[model samples]
Target chain A: EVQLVESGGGVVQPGRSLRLSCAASGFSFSSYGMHWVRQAPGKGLEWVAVIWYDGSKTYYGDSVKGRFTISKDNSKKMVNLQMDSLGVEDTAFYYCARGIAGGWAFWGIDLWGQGTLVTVSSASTKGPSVFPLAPSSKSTSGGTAALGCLVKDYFPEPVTVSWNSGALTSGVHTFPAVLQSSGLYSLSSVVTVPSSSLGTQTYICNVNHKPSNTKVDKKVEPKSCA
Target chain B: DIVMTQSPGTLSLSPGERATLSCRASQNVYSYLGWYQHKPGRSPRLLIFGVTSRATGVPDRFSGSGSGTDFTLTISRLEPEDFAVYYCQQYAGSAYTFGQGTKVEIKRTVAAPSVFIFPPSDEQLKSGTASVVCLLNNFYPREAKVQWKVDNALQSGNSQESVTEQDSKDSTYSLSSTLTLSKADYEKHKVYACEVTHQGLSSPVTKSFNRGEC
Candidate 1:
């Protein structure tokens, strides 16, 4: 019954401020702590901040650093992360996961809110327009698994693709950006990993777009073989 | 990142006994490690962190010792609530990692899983995809593996989802594994086999499902 539920994310303009909340239940809110973790559209886990379980201490990571503040209302069983002077690079999914210590354990974020997508946007600019990075077929075949990251409906060209926490270099096929009918651009990148690399091993695809200054991330969990 | 290797898949003990679970990192992690307790169907709870610090509300009997690459979570005079599985996690590596859980089981009794398969619903089939879910309920010792086979051919990709309450229920776990297949897959495959293996069982349990099922 103990769980953490996140308030959904939003699209905020640059230089503006956004507040994200995580509601806790089934456990003593004052006795536990919460941390704000995020990832660009297709990047790796970046530490945002940590609010100690007792609501006594707060620590910020370089990801948000001086621009972010974390606060809690124990009586309401909620923790909120407020980011100010949001840069276009602040386009990512913010997650509020709970833990007792410094939010480092696998279980630290076990009971976490569904990621709140906080995309820093503006009327004149656009970030990556993709949802739920999709993996291609081949978890079967008893051979290798190919995961795909499709970045669609974005402007400008030149996007860098990386895999496995955005550092994977080999077995990656990054297609050239194609101009869409709407004048925007789209691209697809696929990373083929061994079928044996399933479970425990996650294949993450990251797309870095210079125009938007945003890095998008999608995670693919390969299927295990017998 | 460091690779965390946990040993002794199963640890047996009595309610009042003491048991120590071990976790070793690929490299030195100093005191940057923690221990966690996971009961089926419930969120995993933190037990110890920072090498030896216990989480709030945790009984003092549950203590952590060791540093660098070696860490151990020892439970003294074990409480019934502490019989669940335990996992060790560390961030000393470039990438964070967790141990392959150690089940702190009591005594030496085993309850084989009740296996059955649930095929995709009509609505699901309408989408041109099939998801076959294998249900394995009421099993003991927590260390159970499920495999999927199509027409006798091994079809991997079945992940276990567990459920069982601590202290308030039968300690036996109910697990589920879902196998997803696209339209072309169902056209090529006729039957599915859900194979479950546990240390308590002499032989694995195999259950079958036909794609044509209504």
Candidate 2:
């Protein structure tokens, strides 16, 4: 049930300071060790720093020695990353990940945030690609219908989901939008309804992405279900 | 030291479908890439090793073949349990660093059908009329069939079936089918059968009520 989340990405001027926040849910923030990892444009992931589970100590990668601050607010269940004198070269996705208890035998890097994009002095700002997958028309024991929508390849954060003027209700399941190895963020929102009558109607899933100001409306035709 | 990158972050598909996940090393690692299947709260299961070999007990449906920097994992046909995450790892660096995962999800969730048969009260039989109701629980796709039969003979046009469903939850279709017959047939002490069919079943299911018995 452990999930890590980071505030969306941002743009900063060269030589300016920046701070990113990582939040934890469904798990004790103070129990597991935490590490910060970032990937520069056109490169591999670089482990930036590590903080002890109890928040008592800190260690840095050779590349970020004395250049980064990895701190946490135990009271808020959050971790803060601070960087200064930023450069265009500093453009990358910043991620906070969980570390397994002592091990050179295994790479305990399992959990990761969707990542916060950091672009110093703009270069290539990308937007999302949205698609509403086909909907399932069958009625559930609970008398409901469901649909899936995919939003991928985006930078910056914040996307909105809405159903057609039709009858779409709660029970929506959403996961953290993830940053892919390709350096872009993506996510899927699963929506459910109270009645399978939607099987007789044309319904749509609207994904409105911020920064990109893109509105994608994907709709499906009616089909009968047992 | 080469960077390993994975693509198409996630895959959307239905069961019995094909899935291909990719992993690319910045440099050729001499077929050192290994692939594994992962799910929440479970240990990762090995699927491929040395790039093309299947791990022990792994299904033939799970296959892989790639060389140098480019590697791919493919599923000949996806089963319900196959809808999870697959990650790749390369030991060339002698480091166990793993690639970001590729997710395979179902286009729609469906459930198997469980059926029950309920017969009308003796008073209805005494009143010269009776009805048998069949309840089908946990079915999906809504494309299901129900039939009423008496002593092995099909009952025509007098039966009704209704459906209801859910969300987020394992929501499946709960259907109620009712068939009405004359009291004369009831007094004949004949067996009444309720038969149901759905995608969840390889064969139709039949529930019967014995003669004049509860």
Candidate 3:
């Protein structure tokens, strides 16, 4: 029944300061710790900071060390994240989660707020253009062939690339998205399937960017082995 | 800073089975270690911290023990809801780092919930009052939350009611929520969205409908 709600996020000017809040209810605030996490528009999750319920310690992630401050108000059962000198890279969806602790060590976040979108507007919002690249094929021991999903020309970083071949399968080889001099990002992933199953099986590469509501699905139909 | 690594990147087991997950640190983390369970779509929960101490409300069957560079999290008897990812974190250094994560999947998987939206028809739209029903069916782990949003704003009015029913045969669950809205609002083409969150999903399932489209 524990609930956490996050608030206070919007467009912030570069070099300015912003304070975000997470309110807790349905459980004793003093009994657990609170942790802050962030996800850039289209990126993965990152741990930011945490405030222990005992009021004895606070830990900040190496990435946000000096630029961010984590504090708590016992009376209000609220945890706050204050960030200064905001920049484009700092724009993200911030979340507050309840942390279970035992003495000085802390565990994971169990309950989380819906998330507050914080955008530092250094420039106008731009969504990435996504498409699939022709995959290189190779034969393995069996009659299996490996296909690559090479995606290119994504902007503003933060993109989720996943593979869907009927049921969710793993062993997808994904390279880290690199930021190019053009300010765009590019990445690739590969999936393997039995050669006999190529025409019968359809593989899809899905690229998603939540902030921009951009979703691209590229379908690959493997041709017959020559 | 200490480095954390978990073994058997993926774990598959059945309910009532004994499960042991291990985490190893580059250096001695002392007792400054914590264990977490991360289900899909929900926040990760702390299972154990301070090396051997269980977190508040953690079941006694889940225990942690170890020292120096090696630590272990053992679940004496896995429950139906126990299948998920587990992470180990170390706090002995200036910065905390978590393991890559060990996904504890169940041999028999539960299906994701099927969401359905029932909107008012043209006849009902002229009645000045309408109700939208959001249905979630055949999902495991009865724990779930449903939220309603109107025109992109969260709705907290008492006009919404949620009901849960358990399937005796499969032990799965089904949930439905009804949101009552005024016809005036629907005429404006207001967007109504229902979001469902469960431990079995990595992200909440959301379905939004426009006034006339639904």
Candidate 4:
């Protein structure tokens, strides 16, 4: 099984430069091609650039034609992408995929590496602090009860919020994080349960802040169904 | 630079049915064309290139063919996961151009037809009688009309439409209409046009030709 591993993700200030890397294994690196792809937060995927196995040819997408450079080291089985003069829009999750060559061009990207999130912001000096707030309950017209967990006072943006119910559940919704005037963020996550399971079901909210090494969980039981 | 336009915008067909898609270039693209399939969350995969050559590992059901400015991409037996957006790209020149894209979804019926007119060849202009052909392909329902005109006036005589043939691979229909005109009459008129009327079109699509080489 061929594998591609991506690394070198970090915060970069605007107008600076950064280099991302992808290492390949379990196959002959010099026999195939490598392509760079990216996806902005909450956006679709975009093809950035490609490097042939022979290290002789390269092609860039129209949007990144002049700003990004793609290169490869056949001996090391690694591909690298260098971006210069970054802006806020350059913040994205970058990935590398192995390109299957056809007659004169590539067939497509088959194996992909885990994406590396690169942030191009000047104010992101520290990671966010995760905290799970209390839960609230409401009654739905379908004779079900809706339970919600509000995660508040996180700084430096983006936290993974998830919910866990004792039994099988459905209709879990996580809202987008909203930034406050103080540069902190808050978001809410909700899950619906049948009225029969409300009093007996225990719902827990788990918040994780990767960079800060923080994990918090708060649990609540439905008291009054309004 | 060549510009490519794909018709039907969105194609709908059921699994095991055939899907025929079209891509038209603004100018002659020779055989330097390629087709790609893109799923929503994945990168685009090359299906056909050099007009008809399938990429490595690509299934045989997908085929492509065309010359000059007209091209076709046909999927013989569409599977459940085959629903996605398709794009056509031209690499005839140093710069590459891609079509807007045609989406394939799940449906049960045939689609409407798209039409295009090839410019007159040099031999046609020099001969005593010139023949102009209009192509109507990728239409479902298989019924369409092609009318010829000279200098914006309706034309009669020396015109014939070919039998509509349903493609076995994709189930789409392709037909052509030829208009023969005397060299003297063609030279006298500033423009020759072919108007295509089909149920799929909001209005009839028309293409005009002049006494020029393709």
Best by lDDT: 3
The C-alpha local distance difference test score for the whole of candidate 1 amounts to: 0.66
lDDT of each: 0.66, 0.66, 0.69, 0.68
Interface RMSD of each: 14.8, 16.4, 16.7, 24.1
What DockQ do you compute for every candidate structure? 0.03, 0.02, 0.09, 0.02
User: DockQ order of candidates, best first?
Assistant: 3, 1, 2, 4
Per-residue C-alpha lDDT of model 4 across residues A44-81, encoded as one tens digit per residue? 45667777788898888777788999998876768999
* TM-score of candidate 1 relative to the true fold: 0.45
Candidate 3 residue B157 Cα shift, in angstroms, is 51
For model 3, how does the per-residue alpha-carbon lDDT over B1-214 read when each residue is reduced to its tens digit? Answer: 6678899787767779999999999998877787888654455677887788777789999999888999999999988778777888887776677887877755545667756554543444565656565656667765678888888888775233333333334545555565656787766656878888887878998877665431
Q: After superposition, how far is residue A136 of candidate 2 from its true place, in Å?
A: 37
lDDT of 4 at B133: 57
Once superposed on the true structure, which residue ranges of model 3 sit more than 4 Å away at CA?
A9-18, A27-33, A38-47, A52-57, A74-77, A85-93, A98-101, A104-123, A126-226, B12-18, B27-30, B52-61, B75-83, B105-214
User: Judged by DockQ cut-offs, is candidate 3 incorrect, acceptable, medium or high?
Assistant: incorrect
TM-score, chain A only, candidate 3, equals 0.57
Better of 2 and 4 by lDDT: 4
Give lDDT tens digits, candidate 2, residues A63-156: 6666678898998889888887777677777878775543322224456776777877633456666544334322245565555555556766
**What DockQ does model 3 achieve?**
0.09
What local lDDT does model 3 show for residue B200? 80
